Write a protein that binds this ligand. Structure first.
Ligand SMILES: *[C@@H]1O[C@H](CO[C@@H]2O[C@@H](C)[C@@H](O)[C@@H](O)[C@@H]2O)[C@@H](O[C@@H]2O[C@H](CO)[C@@H](O[C@@H]3O[C@H](CO)[C@@H](O)[C@H](O)[C@@H]3O)[C@H](O)[C@H]2NC(C)=O)[C@H](O)[C@H]1NC(C)=O
Ligand SMILES: *[C@@H]1O[C@H](CO)[C@@H](O)[C@H](O)[C@H]1NC(C)=O
Ligand SMILES: *[C@@H]1O[C@H](CO)[C@@H](O)[C@H](O)[C@H]1NC(C)=O
Ligand SMILES: [Zn+2]
Lengths: 181, 20, 182
């Protein structure tokens, strides 16, 4: 197999409480090992491994480089949040809820955004706690998520099952009912 | 409105090691 | 791991010897906001809906890629030519939504734990290569510095349909064929 050598630079912005607490961490990586980094909570470049020492010393000695990187916390992180992230955070895509048996009953909650969601199972209006298994949150990659929640059914064909879903895009919870044919 | 971005810093030449 | 309400990469700059080739993208909470196509030299959106959140001057990515190239060459020497390790990718195939005969849908092939970022993902309909309706994401970043990539196949659910996602990667003994279990 062909040999490969990889370089990765990640200018990462971490946000908490709106933009009240923001942290910039730029990471320099060789293959999968970060060797140098600038952490805004530190204020100067630091070697993460010995191979990053030459750069940490060089970059910290360059006034334009150091001041420029220190300024990125605002010019990149905070301004990207103002121009784009605040708006993206307002994006709302309502989930589609469908029930079908696979005994297990599966509630498929698909195509929603953001990822925060709450799915509950009810049997004859009684919330089910046991016999409930859920898949991890599934990232579709197209700015939507999906999640599946299974419930162990009872032998009684007369029982009414309800999948209850709460999401930021919903003013009122979505409830879908299912009962054997 | 064009978005800002972080700049990759230019590595120091010569810092040990040898090509193999 | 750093704890935060939200995390963005502005941006992810990748450059590798094989090719050589690079990639430039901005991510927000794990999804790709936009990317710069280094071949046509244009900022583009895999999902046009997000263009309203801001454009990007591609020259910034081109400059960063030139610096990345310089840095890679220097780091290869500092690390005594230690080559990348080919990791074993993990593949899963699933539909975007519940499948209904005659109702357009999309099959999703997730290739996780990718490294190095070189992979061929194709789709097979009953064993035959299919290119129409196929698209994919960029190599999306992970905190352990490996990547994940997703391929999509739009299709019209039909009786007797048969689909497989085929993945080629140096970390695999042979191409991996993942059958979609409807
Ligand atoms: C989450 O963040 C909010 C907002 O903080 C504000 O906005 C950020 C983006 C930064 O610019 C901050 O520097 C800025 O304060 C916090 O709420 C804010 O808390 C401060 C301190 O308690 C409040 O300051 C007061 O302001 C009044 C006048 O408005 C004065 O009379 C007081 O003397 C004092 O200065 C500020 O009003 C308040 N603003 C908001 C939006 O509520 C909040 O505390 C923080 N939450 C946590 C858990 O940290
Ligand atoms: C790199 O090569 C030098 C020269 O042989 C050696 O002394 C050093 O231990 C090696 N370390 C690495 C992997 O950078
Ligand atoms: C991907 O496909 C191309 C074209 O067939 C081939 O040259 C290359 O070796 C493949 N790469 C991998 C990772 O198998
Ligand atoms: Zn500012």
């Amino acid at each position: 197999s062909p040999e490969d050598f990889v370089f990765q630079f990640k200018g990462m912005c971490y946000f908490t409480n709106g933009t009240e607490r923001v942290r910039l961490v730029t990471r320099y990586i060789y293959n999968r090992e970060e060797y140098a980094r600038f952490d805004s909570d530190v204020g100067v470049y630091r070697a993460v491994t010995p191979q990053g020492r030459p750069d940490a010393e060089y970059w910290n000695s360059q006034k334009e480089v150091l001041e420029g990187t220190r300024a990125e916390l605002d010019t990149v992180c905070r301004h990207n949040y103002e121009v784009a992230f605040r708006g993206i955070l307002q994006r709302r895509v309502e989930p589609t809820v469908t029930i079908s048996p696979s005994n297990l009953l599966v509630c498929s909650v698909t195509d929603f955004y953001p990822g925060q969601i709450k799915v509950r199972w009810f049997r004859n209006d009684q919330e089910e706690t046991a016999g409930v298994v859920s898949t991890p949150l599934i990232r579709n990659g197209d700015w939507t998520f999906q999640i599946l929640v299974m419930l162990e059914m009872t032998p009684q064909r007369g029982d009414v099952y309800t999948c209850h879903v709460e999401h930021p895009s919903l003013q009122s919870p979505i409830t879908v009912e299912w009962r054997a044919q | 409105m064009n978005l800002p971005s972080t700049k990759v810093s230019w590595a120091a030449v010569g810092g040990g090691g040898s090509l193999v | 791991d750093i704890v935060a309400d939200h995390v963005a990469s502005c941006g992810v700059n990748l450059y590798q010897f094989y090719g050589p080739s690079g990639q430039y993208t901005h991510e927000f909470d794990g999804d790709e906001q936009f990317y710069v196509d280094l071949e046509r030299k244009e900022t583009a959106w895999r999902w046009p809906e997000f263009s309203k959140f801001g454009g990007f001057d591609p020259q910034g990515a081109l400059r960063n890629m030139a610096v990345a190239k310089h840095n890679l060459n220097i780091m290869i020497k500092r690390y005594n030519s230690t080559a990348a390790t080919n990791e074993v990718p993990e593949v899963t195939v699933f539909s975007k939504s519940p499948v209904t005969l005659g109702q357009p849908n999309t099959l999703i092939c997730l290739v996780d734990n990718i490294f190095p970022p070189v992979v061929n993902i194709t789709w097979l309909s009953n064993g035959q290569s299919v290119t129409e309706g196929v698209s994919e994401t960029s190599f999306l970043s992970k905190s352990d510095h490996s990547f994940f990539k997703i391929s999509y196949l739009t299709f019209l659910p039909s009786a007797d349909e048969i689909y497989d996602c085929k993945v080629e990667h140096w970390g695999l003994d042979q191409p991996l064929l993942k059958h979609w279990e409807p």
